[PDB]
Amino acid sequence: MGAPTLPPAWQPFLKDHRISTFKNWPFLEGCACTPERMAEAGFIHCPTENEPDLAQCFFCFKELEGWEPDDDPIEEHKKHSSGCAFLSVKKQFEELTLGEFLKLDRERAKNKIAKET
Amino acid sequence: MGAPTLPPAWQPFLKDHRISTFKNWPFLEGCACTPERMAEAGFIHCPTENEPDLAQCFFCFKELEGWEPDDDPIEEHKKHSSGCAFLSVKKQFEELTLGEFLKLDRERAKNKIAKET
Ligand SMILES: [Zn+2]
Numbered sequence: 370m371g372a373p374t375l376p377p378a379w380q381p382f383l384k385d386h387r388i389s390t391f392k393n394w395p396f397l398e399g400c401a402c403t404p405e406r407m408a409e410a411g412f413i414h415c416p417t418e419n420e421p422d423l424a425q426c427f428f429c430f431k432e433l434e435g436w437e438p439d440d441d442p443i444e445e446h447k448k449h450s451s452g453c454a455f456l457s458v459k460k461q462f463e464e465l466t467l468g469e470f471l472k473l474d475r476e477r478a479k480n481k482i483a484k485e486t
Numbered sequence: 487m488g489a490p491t492l493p494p495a496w497q498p499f500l501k502d503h504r505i506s507t508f509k510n511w512p513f514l515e516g517c518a519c520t521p522e523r524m525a526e527a528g529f530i531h532c533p534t535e536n537e538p539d540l541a542q543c544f545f546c547f548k549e550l551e552g553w554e555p556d557d558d559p560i561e562e563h564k565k566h567s568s569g570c571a572f573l574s575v576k577k578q579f580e581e582l583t584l585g586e587f588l589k590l591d592r593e594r595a596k597n598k599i600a601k602e603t
């Protein structure tokens with residue numbers, strides 16, 4: 370496996386994790402929607418029953434399908450909504466500050482409620 | 487209660503927690519071994535059956551009893567051993583960096599093994 374020892378709490382927060390979710394995804398090489406390229410924007414593998422080419426984003430929630438070899442993920446989600454406060458974040462897990470880490474927990478839980486109400 | 491939403495994993499890491507452990511402890515006012523004064527060094531309430539005046543330290547393990555109104559906790563533990571890498575740490579939970587947070591987990595688990603072997 371080769372993965373950290375973090376609980377299910379803030380697992381998705383990890384980059385490797387979001388990338389592991391990607392099983393196949395045709396958009397790999399020669400495309401701006403690669404596993405690591407997309408996961409870096411919050412998008413996590415979540416293909417539907419009929420629409421396998423559907424990549425949704427966590428920490429905000431936003432289903433997006435019909436990608437092409439030239440659709441920046443970070444710009445995609447943000448373009449529709451900046452629900453992901455991590456998009457801008459450019460500091461490794463062990464680089465950012467705790468204060469910023471916890472602050473995220475509030476955002477995630479916040480977005481979840483938005484879905485309902 | 488008024489306490490964060492952190493799991494049992496790294497609970498003691500919190501200052502308020504280490505302080506909450508202190509039930510009574512005579513050394514409160516007019517002493518250098520107050521609840522907040524000691525907890526700041528890693529010492530957590532842990533009175534024995536016969537020796538209620540015994541304050542041990544976590545993240546290192548070190549039983550110390552027979553305190554007096556002039557025994558710096560941080561200097562006490564360190565004096566005998568610097569098992570607590572947090573002693574020097576002077577940054578609030580949301581102040582320090584993640585890298586330093588995780589690095590601690592290794593120390594704690596390390597000290598635990600030392601006890602056995
Ligand atoms: Zn997102």
Ligand SMILES: [Zn+2]
Pocket residue numbers: 527528529543544545546547548563569570
């Ligand atoms: Zn200690």
